[PDB]
Design a protein around this ligand. Structure first.
Ligand code: NFU
Ligand code: SF4
Ligand code: SF4
Ligand code: F3S
Ligand code: MG
Lengths: 269, 598
């Protein structure tokens, strides 16, 4: 009897859903068929309209306090919540209704975790992260824009195997994935350590894989698994492909100035 | 009740609501009215989300814009980044080096294939395929069907199909049907035989496993997928063959090539044949509904020039067709204030004058959530949306005042027209369409022992089947094109050109204190544009008009309906409270609602 997952979508770009299905270990096919029961997820579910609505009532009843609520995106508080409408009603109402009987709540990505691109200034919809709306339930934050596929399924696999939320840091993120900064194990560190930096795009330094600090890399202040686990079954990561980290797993990264402005106080790193 | 574009709109019949519309990206509500015979006589497309990226962008650095607007959508991920860097480059008069152009083309074409294939199998297929019928299919005949539908596809044996069938059986017999829960299985709207059903559900699973490999091309050039990195002035993935420490080397390019070769195989052996087969069978059942505006008015900006910065060499050549006249393609200029314009007469925004449409350089995005007096329900609990007033978060783009359909179908109709006019750059799409028509009309019916038909492309393409067909054909063509781009890239690098970025105008001190730019992209769902105004190094205005904005649009000032609403008209429903036909047709546009509203 597989654990039900109700996957809700607020204001979002659907990139977290897409990242999830890229997972190789385990395959998304194997999680959906053999590990979880993915009963509500507007991206892939057969039913629509009233028939889709009816699913939520059914699984909350039968599996009360034994389903996981996964949330992608977030609720807006402006426009009376109607900048995200589901079933003719504000998304925040659906969020609160499904959350109340969930065993655990997963905030997928930077949107759900922290506010995301829509909460960047001046935040016209007053998009608000899940944990600032649901205050009485256990929430695990899985940030990143989107998070790595294997981090997403890795959280799921852990919760399914042990029936527990993994150990979280102060900000509510799982330590098994977010304990290191990109800068800790970045393969370009030796260059940083010797003061070997790219100064302009495609200069000689860039062609030698020199550190991207002076091009704005936010790896020194960004917690994620990108430098070790890496992306799309370990194929690359932003820095390996030549662009600095933009800090996409961190709270409010859209409003920490230009992505190409270097961090100040290089001595601290 | 009123008439518009040859459609007799009438809201006197039974109102039916579909909210949420599922198996799309983002959030949509659809309402229709049907007559005494369950024929849709009115259709209302409501975009039910908004985030305000255009507002968020104000005052920011143009060089950072791509990353913001990339997060408009993680499905068509990177097409917005492409539009943005093109718009800034256009504003600042920046020419990117040849390698950067080719890498962007390869990234664009990889997105096309991934997006198209995943859409058909994982979002669209369940409108055509009964999964429960697949359970009671004979494994043997399915192998036989597989050999006729695609002889070259080596996963054909009966055990393999039995094995797949059994996992499905055990799955459903658990009582936890997951994504198949409360499905419309057994509707008479499904016409496929068990064997075709099992064949498709099998490819659904194959595509689900394979799709994750294809995007590794994005990962190599752009670091991650979803949301690979882009760059104003070129690409960040600097090149060095030998002279392991650089983003791009020969080994990385060989990897890219191997993925491209796999794509070409999937497209020609799995995706295109399935759609041809499924299309044939639904054509045989007489389900040629859903043409909507495709029968009259189609548009694309035109894309994929085989020589950079020369639009006459576009391999998917664009323009606009009006009134079903495929002998005259009007040129489309995104800079012309009198061509692309957006209205908000029936959208939840406000202008200083809502009787006019604004060209996006003059675009305005001030939210205005207000419901009409004929609304049933309340502001926070809608039962029946009032389409006579403002009813969507989607703006209403038009071209010289005309309502247009955009997307792969529009591009393939435009390519057909261009090719008949003498345009040689569109030969491949033309040959794809004629080959497809001949398969759908004659070859596949003969192989399955069905009667032959004689539909012309004119009759066949303006249909939900045609719209689905065009998407699969476009995936194939894109795979073939990036195969060529890959060789051109490797050739250029070997000749000695390793350049990947033009940084002459990277620093804002070199910029004009005021400038405007536009970037266009043939995104998976149709015609995408970003229009930017730059002032004192900051974004003064940034406006996006996105393909689903075109297709999903509500009515304009004149009351003209958009592509979604038109495509639902004149469609019979087997059962009014099962939205099978609504979903089949809406999904044939591949609705991206986060895109539409951004
Ligand atoms: N294709 C696509 Fe997006 Ni998710 C749309 N519509 C676009 O630019
Ligand atoms: S976190 Fe990023 S990828 Fe996930 S929904 Fe939000 S904008 Fe998209
Ligand atoms: S600054 Fe960025 S590129 Fe340089 S070592 Fe740290 S994480 Fe790596
Ligand atoms: S931009 Fe995001 S994907 Fe990893 S390298 Fe930085 S945290
Ligand atoms: Mg817009």
């Amino acid at each position: 009897p597989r654990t039900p997952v109700l996957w809700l979508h607020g204001l979002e770009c659907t990139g977290c859903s897409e990242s999830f299905i890229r997972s190789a270990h385990p395959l998304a096919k194997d999680v959906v068929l053999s590990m979880i029961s993915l009963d509500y997820d507007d991206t892939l579910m057969a039913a629509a309209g009233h028939q889709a609505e009816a699913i939520l009532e059914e699984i909350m009843t039968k599996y009360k306090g034994n389903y996981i609520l996964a949330v992608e995106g977030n609720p807006p508080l402006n426009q009376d919540g109607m900048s995200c409408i589901i079933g003719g009603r504000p998304f925040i109402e659906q969020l609160k209704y499904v959350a109340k009987d969930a065993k655990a709540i997963i905030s997928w990505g930077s949107c759900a975790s922290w506010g995301g691109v829509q909460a960047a200034k001046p935040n016209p919809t007053q998009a608000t992260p899940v944990h600032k709306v649901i205050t009485d339930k256990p929430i695990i934050k899985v940030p990143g824009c989107p998070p790595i596929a294997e981090v997403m399924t890795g959280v799921i696999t852990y919760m399914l195997t042990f029936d527990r939320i993994p150990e979280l840091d102060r900000q509510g993120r799982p330590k098994m994935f977010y304990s290191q900064r990109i800068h800790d194990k970045c393969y370009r560190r030796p260059h940083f350590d010797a003061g070997q930096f790219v100064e302009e795009w495609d200069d000689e330094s860039a062609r030698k894989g020199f550190c991207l600090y002076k091009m704005g890399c936010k790896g020194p202040t960004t917690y994620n698994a990108c430098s070790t686990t890496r992306w799309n079954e370990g194929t690359s990561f932003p820095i390996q492909s030549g662009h600095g980290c933009i800090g996409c797993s961190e709270d409010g990264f859209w409003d920490k100035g230009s992505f190409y402005d270097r961090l100040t106080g290089i001595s601290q790193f | 009740a009123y008439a518009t574009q040859g459609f007799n709109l009438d809201d006197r019949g039974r109102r039916i609501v579909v909210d949420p519309v599922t198996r799309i990206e983002g959030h949509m509500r659809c309402e229709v009215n049907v007559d005494a015979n369950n024929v849709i006589r009115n259709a209302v497309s409501t975009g039910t989300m908004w985030r305000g990226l255009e507002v968020i962008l104000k005052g920011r650095d143009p060089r950072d814009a791509w990353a913001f607007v990339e997060r408009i959508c993680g499905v068509c991920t990177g097409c917005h980044a492409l539009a943005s860097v093109r718009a800034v480059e256009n504003a600042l008069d920046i020419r990117i080096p040849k390698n950067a152009h080719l890498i962007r083309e390869i990234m664009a074409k990889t997105l096309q294939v991934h997006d198209h294939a995943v859409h058909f199998y994982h979002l669209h297929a369940l409108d055509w395929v009964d999964v429960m019928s697949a359970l009671k299919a004979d494994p043997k005949r399915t192998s036989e069907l597989q050999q006729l539908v695609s002889p070259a596809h080596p996963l054909s044996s009966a055990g393999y199909f039995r094995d797949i069938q059994n996992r499905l059986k055990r799955f459903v017999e658990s009582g936890q049907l997951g994504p198949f829960m409360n499905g419309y299985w057994g509707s008479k709207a499904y016409v496929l035989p068990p064997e075709a059903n099992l064949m498709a559900v099998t490819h659904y699973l194959e595509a689900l496993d394979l799709q994750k490999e294809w995007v590794k091309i994005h990962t190599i050039f752009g670091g991650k997928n979803p949301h690979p990195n882009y760059l104003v002035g070129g690409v960040p993935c600097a090149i060095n063959l030998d002279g392991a420490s650089a983003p791009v080397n020969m080994e990385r390019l060989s990897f890219v090539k191997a993925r491209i070769d796999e794509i070409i195989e999937f497209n020609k052996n799995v995706y295109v044949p399935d759609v041809l087969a499924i299309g044939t069978l639904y054509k045989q059942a007489g389900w040629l509904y859903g043409g909507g505006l495709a029968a009259t008015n189609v548009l694309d900006y035109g894309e994929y020039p085989n020589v950079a910065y020369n639009k006459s060499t576009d391999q998917l050549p664009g323009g606009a067709i009006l009134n079903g006249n495929w002998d005259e393609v009007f040129p489309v200029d995104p800079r012309d204030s009198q061509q692309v314009q957006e209205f908000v007469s029936h959208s939840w925004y406000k202008y200083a004058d809502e009787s006019v449409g604004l060209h996006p350089w003059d675009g305005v995005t001030e939210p205005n959530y207000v419901l009409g007096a004929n609304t049933k329900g309340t502001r926070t609990r809608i039962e029946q949306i009032d389409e006579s007033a403002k009813y969507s978060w989607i703006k209403s783009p038009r071209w010289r005042g005309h309502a247009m359909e955009v997307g792969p179908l529009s591009r393939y109709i435009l390519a057909y027209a261009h090719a008949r006019s003498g345009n040689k750059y569109a030969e491949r799409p033309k040959e794809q369409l004629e080959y497809s028509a001949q398969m759908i009309n004659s070859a596949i019916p003969k192989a399955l022992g069905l009667p032959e038909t004689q539909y012309t492309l004119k009759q066949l393409l303006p249909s939900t089947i045609g719209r689905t067909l065009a998407r699969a054909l476009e995936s194939q063509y894109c795979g073939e094109m990036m195969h060529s781009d890959w060789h051109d890239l490797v050739a250029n690098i070997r000749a000695g050109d390793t350049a990947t970025a033009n940084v002459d105008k990277w620093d804002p001190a070199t910029w004009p204190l005021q400038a405007k730019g536009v970037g266009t992209v043939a995104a998976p769902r149709g015609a995408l544009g970003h229009w930017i105004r730059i002032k004192d190094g900051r974004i003064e205005n940034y406006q996006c008009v996105v393909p689903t904005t075109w297709n999903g649009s509500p009515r304009d000032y004149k009351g003209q309906i958009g592509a979604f609403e038109a495509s639902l008209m004149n469609t019979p429903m087997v059962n009014p409270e099962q939205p099978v036909e609504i979903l089949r047709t809406l999904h044939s546009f591949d609705p991206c609602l986060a895109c539409s509203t951004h």
